[PDB]
């Protein structure tokens, strides 16, 4: 069965990660693509209910989130992950988990101890409308 | 359209074989089935866990949530479980009920024996017939 891919959105709270991810989801579902917004905050209620909010627990939450993304992508989904992921190592580990799974991984930086990504696939900035920004993610996936 | 979980339990009892053959037959019919293997999850998602009593319980708790997540995404989730104890199965069941996902317990007979499974698979049955019995349950 077909395999999906992951778009990982990193950036400070208030940078529009969840808004953009949700609009991309809607636009992809209209396309007939099984898109899915994977939010770590939701996972915290069930799967990840053992974790707290220490830095170590946040790293672990993200490590787990990257494996849930590869699992959903293995199941065919276009996974959209809005996660602050402030450390480069958070994003590097998620990238490595995807490489090992053979799942394509796109990093989108929603720009405003946050370590700024040097080489994202796409950098979004607040001049543009959320609709425009969503279309830029869509253009990235279709390129 | 929400999926469902089939939870296979038993001792070599043919659990992973029936789970795989059901997946294959469902995939041929255009049904999005998926075999969710706890040991595979231990190499990735659950790589933080050891093998203590508490760890084995946590591994099952997490597996049950992964199943509900996948079923919520529309998959028919097939779980060749290592869940010898009744309380294990009960926890998995409760997770599914709390999520509003239908849960089917399939006992691959040959450890606390299931008292009230949806289906009992008997070892005299050719594994084509066993998988077909599972599919018939799912299609009824």
Residue numbers in the entry:
A (entry chain A): 440 to 551, 582 to 612
B (entry chain B): 441 to 451, 453 to 551, 583 to 612
What do the authors say?
The CysN polypeptide also contains a C-terminal APS (adenosine-5’-phosphosulfate) kinase domain (CysC), which exists as a separate enzyme in other bacteria and plants. Alternatively, APS can be phosphorylated at the 3′-position by APS kinase (CysC) to generate 3′-phosphoadenosine 5′-phosphosulfate (PAPS), a substrate for sulfotransferases that catalyze the transfer of the sulfate group onto a variety of metabolites. The structure of CysC is characterized by the canonical α/β-purine nucleotide binding fold, consisting of a five-stranded parallel β-sheet which is flanked on both sides by two α-helices. Structural features typical of APS kinases of this fold family, including the P-loop required for ATP binding (residues 452–458 in CysC), the conserved LDGD motif (residues 477–480) and the lid region (residues 552–581) above the P-loop which closes upon substrate binding, are also found in CysC.
